[PDB]
Structures are given as C-alpha cells and as structure tokens.
Write a protein that binds this ligand. Structure first.
Ligand SMILES: CCCCCC(=O)OC[C@H](COP(=O)(O)OC[C@H](N)C(=O)O)OC(=O)CCCCC
Ligand SMILES: CCCCCC(=O)OC[C@H](COP(=O)(O)OC[C@H](N)C(=O)O)OC(=O)CCCCC
Ligand SMILES: [Ca+2]
Ligand SMILES: [Ca+2]
Ligand SMILES: [Ca+2]
Ligand SMILES: [Ca+2]
Ligand SMILES: [Ca+2]
Ligand SMILES: [Ca+2]
Ligand SMILES: [Ca+2]
Ligand SMILES: [Ca+2]
Ligand SMILES: [Ca+2]
Ligand SMILES: [Ca+2]
Length: 1687
C-alpha cells in the first residue's frame, strides 16, 4: 500500500529528527512570508492573505487582480518545548475583500511546523501551496500561493537565497511544498480504551465513612492529540473502571502529529478535576519503514506520579501527575489499543463503543501470572541524619504498599534500623552479616517474549559498548597496532556471535500483539543486517581506525532495538521511610531484574545481582547537595512457577525467628511474675495478647534449626559525638535538661569527661569542642519546638525563636589507633534497654528459636511464607583494602566572595569515609592525596564484588571558616577490583565530572582500586610516600609522568575591567598559575592611559604531564595593586583546553557604481549581465560574520579573548564577567639537558603595544528581515553606532516603512584602539509619539580587525584601480601590504623588477601573465607592479573586499537572530597615513519610464450584464492600469451598441512608473492611508493588467474579463483575431499547460497583436473577449525624442 509507506517514511523522518531534541522549554522564532499568488479563483477579486500561527495573527493589505503580489513578512515569537512545538499548525487563509461588506473565504491551507523544522536549512524556501476549501476539496483547487517559512531555535540561522526567482515564478509545478502524490488524505487512529485498574483514592472518605476505602475515584481519560481533547465517559466510584470506548483521532498528511497524551482525571463535582496520571504513545516509536503503520496494544500503560496516600490538603508533588518529572509512585495502569485506518474518514462520532468481539479478543491479553520478588538489602550508606529509625519498602505496582489497607500482613518492608556514625562524616545502617530480606508476590501479564528480546539486545549492546570503550582506550593510549587489530577482531567476532540470536517466537503465546509481530520482523531484519555487515567487514576491512563510525551506527541501532513501548510490567519502587513518612524513592525497571528461563542474557542485568541505586527526593530530577541514601540491594524478580531457580541466585542462608516474650515486675526490691498492669506473663511484644509456645509452627518447606532457648539478640581514625540538650518553657529562660548529655539512642548517655578510649586506642586531641559545620548559630546551637505526645524534637532550625522549647549542640573529639538476658524499663510495654536504671520497675526477656529452610526446597522457601520476617545470614566475611588516588580537580565553582573556594572532599565507600586536605583559595586544587581504607568488610562472594563493585563517592565542599561548608559537586565512579595478585595492573586516573545539579561543574582526576585483602595484608602493595604525617602522596605508577615544559604567555592587555569595591582598576597585574608554578607580569601604571602590558611576553618552566589527557588547567588572575599594600584579585579565569596552545617550537546605459558590483557579486541580480562579460571587479559576500568565517580563524589568530570572572557564582553557573584578558599561550616541552640550548620563543613579531589613533569607516549596505517594531508589522529603521564614548545617531535620516532597509550610508569615526575597541552597531525603530525600540545590535572587536594576520582592517579588491568607482581605498599600496605580510610570515623582502613584469614572494617567482590570461583591461587600472602585487595578494587567505552579514542580537530573544545587517568595516590606523578615496555606496535612484498602450480593436466580447434598458445588447470599453498605480486608472471611449462584439477605440494611454533595471522590478512609493505619518515604499514586479469594462445609461459599471501581462515575460500575441486562441495564457490549474512564448518588452521595445481575455466561471476558463493593442516601453530619453501623446 502506497499510503502506509508514505506515513511510515514521514514518521521515521520525525523519529530521527526528534532523537536529539531536549525537553527544556526554550525560545523559538517563526518567520512566515507570503510572496505572490497565482491563478486565484473568482472574478475581479481583491485578495488578502491572513496567517494564523498559535493564536497570533497577521494580515496583508488589499491587493488587486487574480495574480496578486504581496511581499509581506510576518513574525511569531513563542517559547515552547522542542518536543511539543511540532503539535502546532500554520494556517494560511486567503480572503476576497469588499468595499462595504465582510470578507469571503477562498483558500485555506494547513501545515505542521514539524516538516518546516525537518527541512534542510531548518526552513522551506519559495515553495508553492495548494489552496482549497477546508472540507470542499472535491470541488478542485482555488489557486496557488508562493510562501517561505522558517524555524530558528537557539543558535540556528535562516539560509540565504540564490537566483531562483525566475525558476520559481512560471515553473510552479516543480516547486511545490508537497507534490500531487501525497494529496489531501485523512489519517485516522482508532485508540480503543478498554479499562483501568489500581486507580488511587482521589476523593474524600468522609462522605462514605458516614453513610469502602478503595473506590473513591470517578475516572475518565482525556486524550490530547493535535490540540484536540476527547474525554471518555465518567465511571462513578470505581478504582477499576471499564470504559470500552474507541477514540477516533484524526489528522491530515500535511499536519502529522506525533505525541498522544492519555491523562486519567478524577472527576470532581465542585472542585477542579484532579489528575491521576499521564502516559504517552509516541507514534514515531510504534511505526517504522517493508514497514508498518502505527500499531499498539492491547497492552497496559503504567502511570506514575505523586504518592498514592490521600490528603485533603493540596498535593505538593501534583506536578508529577501531569507528566513533568519522572514520577515517584505507581498511579494505576490503563489498557489501550491503537490501530491505523487509512483513507477512510470516520463519522462525526468522536467516541464510539468497542464492538463486542474485540471484547472477547482482549480477554487473552489480561491473563495473570504469579510473580515472586526477593530483595536482599546489603548496605544503606551515606545517611545524613541519625534522628529516628529508617526502613525500606519494596513495592511493584500496588503490591507491597505499606500504607494501603490489606487483608493479610505483608513482608514488603525491612525492620526499623537506626543509623550509626562511620567515624568521619556519614551514617550507615548497621546490617553487617545479617542483611534484611523483603519478599512480596504480585500478579502481572507474562510478557516475557518482549522482555527476553529487550534484555538480550541490551546485553548485546552492553558487550558492544564495553568493546567500544576498549577500542577507544586503545586508540587514546596509543597501543600498538597488533593489539588494536586483535581488539577490533574480538569486537567483530563478538558482534557476529551475538547477532545470530533468534528472537522469541510469536506462536503459542497469548499476549502477542500485532506490534509484537512487526517489532520482531524489524528486529530480525536489523539483526540480520548487522550480522551480514559484520561478516562483510570481517572479510573486507583492514583499517580499524575508519570502521568505528559504522560500529557506533550499530550501537545506536541496537539502542533503537531495545525500545519497548509495550513494557506493561511496572517499575519496582524502593521507598525509604524515616519515621512514618515517605522520604526518598528509587525506580528500578522490572525488566532489569526479571529472570528468564531462556538463559542469562534473557534475564536482566541485575537479576540476582547486587546493584547500587542512589535514592532521590520526590521532586528532584537528579541528586542535589544531599543524597538521602545509597542503597546496595540484590533484587530477583521472576515467575513463581520457576521460583525454585532462585536457589542458584541466592547467597547466604535465609532465617526467620519465631519470638516469645516473658514479662515480670518489681515488688519490694524483688522481681516476680505478678503485678503486671494489664499484661500477660507469656505474651506478645505489646503484652496484650497471650500466646503459647506451640502457636508457632514451620510452614511447608521449612524446618526448625536448634531449639527454643533464650535469645535477647578496622578504624585507624575515628570521631566520637555527644549532644548537649537544654529545655525551657516558651518565653522562659534556658536551663539544662534531665538528659543533659544524649547520643543516637535518644536518651541519656555518658558524659564527655566520663567515656574513655577502648583498649588499644589513644586520643588525638585532649579537649572537646563544639562543631560549627552544621545549621546552627554562632555558638553552635540549633533550636526546635515540641508538641505532645512528642515531648522531644525531631526537626531543628538554625535560628532562635521565643516559642522554642529545646535546643541542642554537637560536640566532637578525634581518636586514633548480662548473660541472664533481662532488659529493663520504667513501664510495661515501654522501651526496654540493656541494664537496669534507678527508675526501672518492670522487666522482660526475649526467648526465640531459629528456623531454616529445608534442603528439598532450598532458599526458595522464603516465597512460601505468605509476621514472619526473613534475614539473610552470611557465614563468611571478606576483608578488602581500598585506595583512592585523588590527584586534582579543575573548573570548580567559586563559592567565596574572593572569587575562589577552599575545596576539600569527602571520600566515601560503603560504611567508611575519610577526608582530603583543604586547599585554600583555588578552583583547581591539587590534593595529590591517597585515601586508604584498610579492613573494609564486604559480604558476598568476591566475584559478585568484581562484577558489580560498590561505588566511591567524591563529595566536594568549599570550606568556610564561619557557617556551613558549601556544596561543590559529586563524582561517582567504580574502583577496579583486584581479587588476586596475577592481574595486578596499574590503575589509571580519569576525569570524572563533578555533577552539581543538572550540569557538570568541573572534573576530578581520580581513580580507585579495591584489593581483596589476604592474610596479614601480604598481597597489598607498599604504602605511598608521606609528605606529611598521615598524608600519602599519589604513588609513582598512578601519578601522571611529568616532563619539563615551557608555557609562554602573551600578556597583551586587559579589556573592559569593571570597578572593584567602587574604584576602577587603575594598577593591575597578571598572574598566570599552572602546575604549582606561577609567573607575574609587570604592573600597569595606569590602565586608562595604557591598556596593554609594556612587557607582553611571560615565561615559566613548569613540570607538566606528558599525556594530553592529564594536562592541568591554566589559571589567569588579575591583581589590582592599590593603596596600603592591598592586592586583591579582581578577575580570574580557568582555561582547561590547552590542546589548541600546543605547538612545535621548531616548526545600453551601463552606468557603473558600487551597487552594480554588489549586485553582480550577489549572484541574484544581473548574473547574466554584461558587467561580468566585460570583466570588472567583484566582491565576496559572506552569509555570516567575518569572525564566523572559518578561513580567517575568527580573527583571533594574534591573541584570543578569555573572559574573567569574580565573586561567588550564580549557584550552578559562571560568575559575573568583570573583564577580559586578551592573549594567547604556547606550550611546548623543553629539553631536560641544560647543555642543549632552549627552543626559540614563539612571540617575536609583536606589534607596538601603545594605543593607536585610527579612522574607522563603517559602511552599511542594507538590512535583511528585521524584527518588526510597530503594530502594523512594519519598522522605520535607522542606525545608531556607539564606539567608546562617541555616538552617531542617524535618527534624522531614518528609512520609513521597511523591513529590508537599503541604508547605503557611511558613518566615519575616529577612536583610540584598544580603549574603544567595542564597536556597537544597533538598529533602532523611529517612532514619532513614543520611545524607540531596539531591533538588535552587533559587537565588533575592532582590535581583532586591526591586529589580525589576515588583513581584516581593509579587504583587498579584485583589481588595483586608481581612478573611477572601484578606486583603491587602503592606505598602503599592494607592494607595501605584500612586504608587510612577507615580514609577518618570516619570508624575505619581495624583489621588484624594474619593468614590473615579475616579482618574488615565498620562494616562488610570479608573473603578470599568470593572472592576466586573456582578460580585457580598461582605463581604470594603474601601475602594473601594484597590479601584480595585488594579483598574488589574494592567494594566501587574506580577507577580500567583502560585505559581511552580521546577525542582530537582542534581549528580546538571546541567541535568536532578530534580523540581519549587510555591512563592512575598514579600520585605518593613522600611523600608516591617510586612507584612499572612499566608496560611494549611496543607493541608486529609479529610472523613470512611461508604458504606452493603444487600444485598437475588440472582437467576440461577451454580452452585457443585465441592466435597466432590458435588451440583448452589448457596450464595450477598455480599462487598463498597473498594480501599485491604481491612481493611474484610465479608460477608453465607448463604442455604443455593438451588434457582434466588435469595438473601435483608438484611445491612447500613458503609464508613469519608476523602474529598477538592475533589480528587474518596478518601484512605487505611496502612503497606505491619508493620515499616515510617512510614505510606504513598495517593491513589486512590473505587470500590466488590462480589463474590459461595461457602461450603462443608468445602472453601474460591470466587469467581463481580464488579462495580465508581466512586462519582463510578455505573451507573444497572435496576428489575427481569428488566430487569438485561448490557452496561450498558461491555464496551470487543471492540467499541465503548454509553455507560453515569452519575450521581454524592455528589450523588444514594441509589439502589436491580439491578446486573449478570460474569466473563470465555476473553476473553468471562459472566453470573455479579445482585444487588439500595441505595447511599447520608452524611458525619459525616448519620451524627450518623441512625444507621448494623449492619455
Ligand atoms: C463532610 C465532607 C465534606 C466534603 C466537602 C467537599 O467537597 O470537600 C472537598 C475537599 C477537596 O476534595 P478533592 O476531592 O478535591 O481533593 C483533592 C485532593 N486534595 C488533591 O489535591 O489531590 O475535600 C477535602 O478537603 C477533604 C474532606 C474535608 C472534610 C471537612
Ligand atoms: C495612552 C497614551 C500613551 C500610550 C503610550 C504607548 O505605550 O504607546 C504605544 C503605542 C504603540 O507604539 P509603537 O507603534 O511604537 O509600538 C510599540 C511596540 N508595540 C512595543 O513593543 O511596545 O503608540 C501609539 O499607538 C502611538 C500614539 C501614542 C500616543 C502617546
Ligand atoms: Ca477528587
Ligand atoms: Ca472525584
Ligand atoms: Ca479537586
Ligand atoms: Ca563559601
Ligand atoms: Ca571558603
Ligand atoms: Ca515602534
Ligand atoms: Ca515605528
Ligand atoms: Ca515605540
Ligand atoms: Ca450592464
Ligand atoms: Ca449596456
């Protein structure tokens, strides 16, 4: 089917155009411009064009004739998401207009913005449209419309144009926007919506608790597609609704929408409709190109969003329910199906019931299979908070939810564990050898045929990506070619052995959809293509450095194949619950842990493997300053039928304890079993339920271990912590509490003067101190309030208030190197602690028995227990030894007010933490420190550690002397694991990003290694050398190998230095620090007087790493030497990309003006003119800036520009720019032998650094497509130029009513470079009664023009002319410029011959005849030696004579072009002399013409319109006018009472019109109303419209027919009225017409003959008559030679 192929190709174009687009809403600008209408329907119409994009509307003025010309440009400014703006439509509707009535619709065209995003150049150019009625399209077309539309986002620019103006006008049938084969075809999607389930409670339960807790929701689905929203029925009071309703989505092929948005809403009668959840169906992801149409389902789509717990208060995370944010809890799921029906249009029912046979079909997609989940919680580290206990809930879907009411108790949560200080900074849950185990059972559809293929292709691409990074490491480490070829052959053999995999069959399985079969066919085709390309490349390719592009193509193809839109299995969400409140979440995709019987590859990556997940706060997109917890968890999901296969995945021995409590009390100082306050002797934990010993029995698959007995349950450095607490009444005075010293238990503890060291320990510091590195006041106290029954606080603030009742202070100190089982409390059922205090009068003891699984069931008996609680016991501990080589950091955030930081780092690994040193006043620290954790206890087998190592976390902090230490970022990386000695290789330092928030805020050069510690640590390597006590250096193998290099700094000068401490930078100096070395420039005496350093060359010999990867950043500082010896830092920059700085140190009436040259160099106007044939000069028009031309290197080849910064940053971003340092660097290694001489310096050709007075001539040519600044869509632009303090405002010489203003004006200035180097060219809008609006601005570094090698101070023309128009405008002759660029390059002085026939340059002799080969020379050329010097001056990349096109920028839209400005700048330094004659770029005037017609005869004119005289009769007379010259409407005399349609007139006409011969376009100026401020300038092609009128004695004048003749392309007439046939005019509407014989009236100055006249009746041409006339065009000279006559 042809149409399904077109839909598939369009959707795959949308797919591969939307695969890099982000989701952050940014700014977009849409330019839609109409040009010209052709063959518009109707009779004597007055057409306008109205464009409606996204609510903003624009409209062109009233034009005339059926072939109108508008040339109107319209703008639209929106800020949408770059995956959402492709839902909008552009509507072009054409309206006939009447003088006294409303408009009438004639044409209508819709188009998606996606296709005009999709086009090359991000825009379509000069394309034609099909105008038709929006639903009466069977009546035929009603005209054509030439438009152009543009899409530009951040950094995008519109494309330029060529000479295609005569290619697009008559040849419409090749320049359509859409061809005829696509047509106006409807596309229908039948989105059947069957049912939903597990919808959360979204209504109040107060109504139902007075008159069920599960069904308090009234859901319906709102389906948003292409702007339209269709709402299904409301199912009142049903958490499992059943709609069974098709939604007939509709589009057309010109407007293809991609994103379907399903949104379940709770219907509320009074309040707003709450949002349950949102899913998306991506049509580009469920369709492909044989290919297939969009298909989906019947498959459940899981919703995610806010937590399911209902609160009547407004929901704080309700933005997650709208689809923004990733969603933290399961919100239910909805069963949908999607089909595509093509070329059939459904009826007006948007919503129909699902047919019953589809309801019996869908039952096989709802089959439930039992699933078993097990989670072994290994470690919960990096906790920031110790107050109250922490548990973890595992839930998949709604199964395992702790807060949901349920019939039986569930084992979905771990026990409440209190955190334990690790001795340095963090906390960890003390799980040790007894890990918590969570087991829950669920029921989902067995969609294993999808997830098997997904997991196997994911394992394929993971192996391929591992081999890809292996080859990348091989080519970056410069490995020998044999090992690289071996790694490449291993990659290719692994790809060959992988992609012979056969996908799971679609037969015999109930849940196979149509999309499953099409996806399997696409996957088989892609895998066979990858396999065959792999065998072909193994058999044919040798260059392994060229095939990796196809290998990355294989990688992103495999990434495309792993996308499963039908993943109905919901994510497993792990929730940390501190107290009774949900705190942090982590979503694991359930396919990643799903077990498959098809093998290890079909199982998930983390199926039965310990994985490290970082929990997140419920609306943070990523981890911020505080990670809540780091979890290592061993999750196994699988079918409950194959749950006996969990025995292979299980490590350790599972264990459940049955418990029994025995209680006593105290009378008269003796304990006894009586006296209990409402509690039993043998009872439960609460004591209220009496339970026997025989009540606990082992279930099936379990057995007893042991017997019923009484069971009451490597740090070299450490830091203790005690807390001091005070209590008071509100408004009272503070006094110490009864628990004056507390701990993590929450009760009284030992005094700081009471606790001592353990044996084998010692004290580092003998005095206690209070911690100031917390959220406290100046004295180290936090404050809080208490509400009963919580008499002790759980949250604290950093400030004191009068209502606070408690306060707390942390104290720290550094450290180095009974059996009866009775637990006592002051009450029964209270908190029993280990030993009896003075107030305890009650006691109890625990008494238990261990249970173990039977050997016949294995470790899978934990799934048969469904309160029995499971814990996994490891019988062996494995000791490890981690070494983190923290070398350095770069580009850290500035978080102090002295524009630096004091960065240190918390190295964390499992339950261990240490801290690096604090490096003061730097953003690029070099810690050079090895952080050693000996004796790290990790449980599980060492192979599981080797496969999935625990992460090392690098939390960087700016140290502050007062207050909190601010957060710099976080680097997470894995250590290389060494389980033995045989694979002992040197670990390699890598730059890991310091992720702060959403972006990287630097990199750290860090690696780590985790060695399995043997017996007495004998296999461990030797300790690194110590540069300080307990301070290890990075050892010699890991540290970068340094060589003596040299850094040359061209300290040229400082620009734009802003004020520091309200005083200007008067006496600055430069400090360049790199590699621990520094150099300092001399102090500038006055920056206002001299802005450049007097000594511009600095030099330092720094030991720098040999590897280009390990190169440290280069730090630039500016120090303002002020009074009293104060030397603050007023600017700093960091330059890490030093690869660019590496260098090898040993390496008729042809009136000629400037505008004729500009047109001939444009290529659009006068391309075939005689100007090029006679061989005059040209110029090079750039479509961008001169700094954006890659040939001239951005004009910073002498010295770059590095922006300096100051102060604290903008919390994620760069700080405020306080200046610029202009300079460059040359880094090159030095010989280590002092006897070998140094390499020569790279800076010897330096110019004079004093300020230079210069005359800058700013030629401004024209503007292109500005932003409108008036309400009528127009502008009145003028030029405002600022240059330091000088300002030229050309407000008196503004150009009225132009979006394309031909300025043509010079603005000559004088300035002192480089104090006034910033040349600002701003275009401003004239307004008479209001303020002026800035259209945009451009910034030109005039010093970059002045100091460049490329000669950008003045472009060099094609030929050296002395007199005339193209005179030499530079100060230096081409010989002087040639010898200057010879002296720049190191070439010798050029040799000038006496006759000028030859010169020498660059070691090559040049000759005049090598460039003057058969070229016609004229009288404007000058000296031959200067001509030859210029003829060789254009060959070495110098800047030619040019018109650059600089894009205007504004704060309206930051990186979006506000317009274009064609112009150029000539900087002339006054030390070289005065410049030459200036160019006259004044715009040329219009040549006046008179178009004279003489109306000879008429023949076969149609009969009269019905008048009062009531006869079959005819009156004929002829009108004629030019569009734009309707004030020149004249007419002939009347031939009354024609009996056969003939009429003699001989009435002469004279048409005054002004013309542009070079632009081939008529020019007219006329105000658009009488009260207009200024005269509108109108640019239209020259066309003559002659129409036949009718006159009556009493009734009005009537219209019969028309003809239209473009004066450049006039229709050659017939020589007789009987030979005056129709269709000489191209019909161009119903069939492909014959080409009209066309000739220009401007050259062929006169012609005579008969022309056809026609009018359209019901879309078909009808002969309205014939006319004989003679057309002649004469200019002013011919009007002077012979008179024009009457008219
Ligand atoms: C006696 C019952 C009167 C009930 C009167 C009534 O109409 O109350 C409506 C409000 C809001 O209820 P919603 O369903 O909009 O909750 C929307 C949801 N919070 C969300 O944002 O997701 O109910 C409550 O505040 C809870 C009951 C308060 C009862 C005082
Ligand atoms: C109510 C009287 C004060 C009104 C002051 C005021 O704000 O006027 C703005 C308007 C439109 O001004 P512009 O055409 O420059 O458009 C500006 C562009 N749309 C923008 O981006 O702002 O002025 C008039 O209508 C002209 C008569 C003014 C008569 C003072
Ligand atoms: Ca509600
Ligand atoms: Ca409701
Ligand atoms: Ca509501
Ligand atoms: Ca700080
Ligand atoms: Ca600091
Ligand atoms: Ca204005
Ligand atoms: Ca204006
Ligand atoms: Ca204004
Ligand atoms: Ca009439
Ligand atoms: Ca008449």
């Amino acid at each position: 089917t042809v149409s399904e192929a077109q839909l598939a190709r369009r959707l795959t174009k949308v797919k591969n155009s939307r695969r890099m687009l982000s989701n952050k809403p940014q700014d977009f600008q849409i330019r839609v411009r109409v040009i010209e209408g052709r063959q518009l329907s109707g009779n004597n119409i007055r057409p306008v064009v109205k464009v409606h994009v996204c609510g903003q509307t624009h409209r062109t003025r009233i034009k005339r004739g059926n072939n109108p010309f508008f040339d109107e440009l319209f703008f639209y400014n929106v800020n949408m998401t770059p995956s959402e703006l492709m839902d909008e439509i552009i509507s072009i509707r054409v309206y006939n207009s009447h003088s006294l009535r409303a408009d009438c619709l004639m044409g209508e065209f819709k188009i998606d913005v996606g296709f005009v995003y999709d086009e090359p150049g991000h825009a379509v150019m000069r394309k034609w449209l099909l105008l038709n009625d929006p639903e009466d399209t069977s009546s035929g077309s009603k005209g054509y419309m030439k438009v152009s539309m543009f899409v530009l986002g951040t950094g995008d620019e519109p494309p330029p144009e060529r000479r295609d103006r005569d290619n697009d006008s008559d040849d419409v049938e090749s320049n359509l926007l859409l061809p005829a084969g696509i047509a106006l075809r409807w596309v229908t999607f039948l989105l059947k919506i069957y049912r939903a389930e597990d919808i959360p409670q979204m209504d109040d339960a107060f109504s139902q608790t007075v008159k069920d807790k599960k069904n308090l929701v009234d859901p319906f689905v709102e389906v948003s597609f292409a702007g339209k929203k269709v709402c299904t029925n409301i199912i009142e009071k049903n958490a499992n609704p059943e709609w069974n309703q098709v939604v007939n989505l509709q589009i057309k092929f010109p407007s293809v929408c991609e994103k379907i948005k399903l949104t379940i809403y709770d219907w509320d009668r009074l309040t707003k409709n709450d949002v349950v959840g949102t899913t998306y169906l991506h049509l580009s992801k469920i369709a492909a190109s044989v290919g297939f149409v969009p298909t989906f389902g019947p498959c459940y789509l899981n919703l995610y969003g806010s937590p399911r717990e209902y609160t009547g208060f407004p929901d704080p995370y309700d933005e997650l329910n709208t689809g923004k944010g990733e969603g933290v809890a399961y919100r239910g799921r909805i069963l949908v199906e999607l089909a595509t029906f093509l070329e059939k249009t459904p009826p007006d029912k948007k919503l129909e019931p699902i047919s019953n046979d589809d309801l019996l079909v869908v039952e096989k997609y709802q089959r439930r299979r039992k699933y078993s989940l097990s989670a072994v919680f290994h470690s919960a580290t990096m906790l920031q908070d110790v107050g109250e206990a922490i548990q973890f809930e595992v839930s998949i879907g709604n199964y395992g939810n702790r807060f949901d009411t349920t019939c039986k108790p569930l084992a979905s949560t771990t026990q409440y564990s209190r955190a334990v200080f690790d001795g340095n900074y963090y906390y960890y849950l003390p799980w040790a050898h007894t890990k918590p185990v969570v087991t829950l059972t669920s029921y989902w559809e067995d969609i294993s045929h999808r997830l098997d293929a997904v997991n196997t292709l994911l394992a394929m691409a993971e192996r391929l990506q591992t081999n890809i990074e292996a080859l990348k490491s091989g080519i970056q480490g410069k490995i020998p070619a044999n090992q690289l070829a071996e790694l490449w052959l291993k990659l290719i053999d692994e790809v060959i052995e992988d992609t012979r995999y056969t996908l799971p069959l679609t037969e015999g399985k109930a849940n196979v959809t149509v999309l499953d079969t099409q996806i399997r066919k696409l996957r088989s085709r892609s895998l066979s293509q990858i396999h065959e390309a792999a065998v072909r490349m193994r058999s044919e390719a040798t260059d392994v450095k060229s095939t990796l592009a196809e290998i990355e193509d294989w990688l992103d193809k495999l990434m495309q194949l792993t996308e499963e839109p039908q993943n109905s299995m919901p994510d497993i969400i792990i929730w940390m619950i501190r107290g009774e409140k949900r705190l942090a979440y982590a979503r694991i995709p359930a396919h990643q842990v799903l077990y498959s019987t098809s093998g290890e590859n079909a199982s998930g990556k983390y199926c039965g493997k310990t994985q490290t997940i970082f929990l997140k706060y419920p609306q943070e997109k990523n981890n911020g300053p505080k990670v809540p917890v780091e979890l290592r968890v061993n999750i196994w999901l699988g079918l409950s039928a194959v749950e006996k296969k969990f025995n292979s995945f299980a490590e350790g021995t599972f264990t459940v304890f049955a418990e029994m409590y025995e209680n006593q009390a105290l009378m008269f100082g003796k304990w006894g079993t009586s006296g209990l306050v409402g509690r039993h002797k043998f009872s439960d934990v609460t004591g209220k339920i009496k339970l026997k010993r025989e009540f606990f029995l082992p279930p099936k698959g379990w057995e007893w271990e042991g017997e019923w007995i009484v069971d009451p349950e490597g740090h070299t450095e450490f830091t203790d912590e005690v807390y001091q607490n005070e209590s008071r009444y509100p408004g009272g005075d503070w006094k110490p509490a009864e628990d004056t010293y507390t701990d993590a238990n929450g009760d009284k503890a030992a005094s700081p003067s009471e606790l001592t060291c353990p044996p084998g320990w010692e004290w580092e510091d003998d005095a206690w101190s209070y911690d100031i590195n917390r959220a406290v006041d100046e004295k180290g106290w936090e404050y809080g309030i208490t509400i009963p029954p919580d008499h002790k606080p759980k949250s604290w603030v950093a400030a004191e208030k009068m209502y606070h009742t408690h306060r707390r202070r942390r104290l720290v100190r550094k450290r180095k190197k009974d059996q009866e089982g009775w637990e006592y409390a002051s009450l029964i059922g209270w908190k029993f602690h280990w030993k009896q205090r003075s107030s305890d009068t009650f006691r109890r003891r625990r008494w238990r028995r261990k249970m173990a699984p039977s050997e016949t069931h294995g470790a899978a008996a934990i799934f048969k227990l469904e309160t029995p609680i499971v814990s996994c016991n490891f019988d062996r501990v494995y000791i490890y030894h981690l070494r983190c080589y923290v070398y350095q950091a770069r580009n850290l955030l500035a978080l102090d007010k002295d524009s630096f930081s004091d960065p240190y780092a918390h190295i964390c690994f499992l339950h261990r933490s240490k801290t690096t040193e604090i490096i003061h006043s730097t953003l690029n620290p070099t810690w050079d420190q090895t952080i050693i954790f000996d004796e790290v206890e990790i449980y599980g087998e060492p192979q599981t550690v080797l496969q999935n190592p625990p992460k090392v976390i690098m939390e960087l902090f700016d140290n502050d002397q007062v207050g909190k230490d601010e957060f710099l970022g976080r680097s997470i990386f894995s250590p290389v694991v060494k389980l033995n000695s045989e694979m002992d290789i040197t670990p390699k330092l890598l730059w890991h990003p310091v992720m702060n928030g959403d972006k990287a805020c630097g990199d750290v050069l860090v690696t780590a290694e985790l060695i399995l510690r043997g017996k007495d640590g004998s296999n461990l390597p030797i300790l690194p050398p110590q540069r300080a006590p307990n301070l290890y250096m990075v050892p010699q193998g890991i540290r970068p190998v340094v060589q003596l290099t040299a850094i040359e700094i061209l300290a040229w000068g400082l620009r734009n230095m802003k004020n520091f401490q309200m005083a200007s930078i008067t006496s600055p100096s430069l400090v360049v620090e790199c590699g621990g070395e520094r150099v300092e420039s001399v102090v500038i005496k006055n920056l206002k007087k001299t802005p450049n350093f007097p000594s511009s060359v600095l030099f330092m010999k720094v030991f720098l790493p040999k590897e280009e990867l390990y190169m440290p950043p280069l730090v630039i500082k500016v120090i303002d030497h002020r009074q009293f010896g104060r030397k603050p830092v007023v600017g700093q920059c960091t330059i890490e990309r030093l690869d660019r700085f590496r260098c090898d140190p040993y390496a008729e009436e042809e009136i000629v003006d400037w505008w004729s040259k500009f047109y001939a160099s444009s290529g659009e106007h006068e391309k075939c003119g005689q100007y090029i044939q006679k061989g005059y000069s040209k110029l090079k028009i750039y479509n961008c800036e001169l700094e954006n031309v890659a040939e001239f290197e951005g004009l910073t080849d002498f010295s770059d520009t590095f922006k300096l910064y100051r102060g604290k940053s903008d919390e994620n971003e760069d700080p405020s720019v306080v200046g610029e340092f202009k300079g460059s660097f040359r880094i090159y290694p030095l010989p280590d032998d002092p006897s070998v001489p140094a390499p020569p310096r790279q800076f010897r050709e330096l110019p004079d650094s004093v300020p230079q007075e210069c005359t800058v001539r700013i030629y401004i040519v024209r503007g292109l497509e500005l932003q409108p600044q008036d309400n009528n869509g127009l502008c009145d632009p003028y030029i405002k130029i600022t240059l330091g303090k000088k300002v030229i405002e050309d407000r008196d010489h503004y150009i009225p009513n132009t979006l394309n203003p031909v300025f043509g004006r010079m603005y000559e200035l004088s300035c002192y470079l480089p104090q006034e180097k910033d040349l600002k060219i701003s275009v401003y809008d004239y307004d008479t009664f209001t303020r002026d609006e800035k259209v945009g601005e451009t910034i030109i570094d005039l010093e970059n023009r002045f100091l460049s090698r490329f000669g950008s101070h003045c472009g060099i023309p094609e030929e050296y002319c002395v007199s005339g128009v193209n005179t030499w405008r530079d100060q230096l002759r081409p010989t002087q410029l040639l010898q200057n660029v010879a002296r720049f390059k190191g070439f010798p002085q050029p040799i000038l011959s006496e006759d000028g026939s030859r010169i020498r340059y660059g070691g090559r002799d040049y000759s005049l005849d090598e460039f003057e080969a058969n070229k016609i020379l004229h009288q404007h050329l000058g000296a031959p030696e200067e001509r030859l010097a210029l003829h060789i001056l254009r060959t070495q990349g110098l800047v030619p004579e040019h018109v650059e096109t600089r894009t205007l920028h504004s704060t309206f839209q930051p990186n979006i072009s506000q317009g274009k400005l064609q112009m150029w700048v000539d900087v002339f330094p006054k030390s070289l002399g005065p410049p030459g004659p200036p160019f006259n770029i004044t715009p040329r005037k219009a040549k006046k013409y008179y178009l004279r017609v003489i109306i000879w005869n008429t023949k076969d004119v149609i009969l009269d319109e019905k008048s009062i005289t009531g006869e079959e009769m005819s009156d004929i007379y002829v009108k004629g006018w030019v569009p734009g010259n309707e004030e020149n409407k004249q007419k002939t005399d009347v031939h009354y009472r024609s009996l056969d349609g003939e009429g003699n007139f001989n009435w002469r006409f004279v048409f005054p019109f002004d013309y542009l011969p070079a632009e081939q376009l008529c020019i007219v100026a006329k105000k658009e109303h009488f009260w207009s401020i200024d005269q509108t300038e109108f640019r239209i092609p020259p066309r003559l419209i002659i129409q036949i009128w009718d006159n009556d004695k009493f009734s009005l004048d009537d219209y019969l027919g028309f003809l239209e003749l473009d004066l450049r392309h006039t229709i050659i007439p017939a020589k007789s009225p009987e030979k005056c046939r129709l269709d000489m005019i191209p019909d161009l509407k119903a069939m492909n017409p014959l080409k009209a014989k066309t000739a220009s009236l401007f050259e062929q100055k006169s012609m005579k003959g008969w022309w056809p006249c026609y009018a359209e009746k019901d879309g078909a041409r009808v002969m309205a008559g014939k006319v004989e006339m003679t057309l002649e065009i004469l200019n002013e000279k011919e009007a002077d030679e012979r008179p024009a006559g009457k008219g």
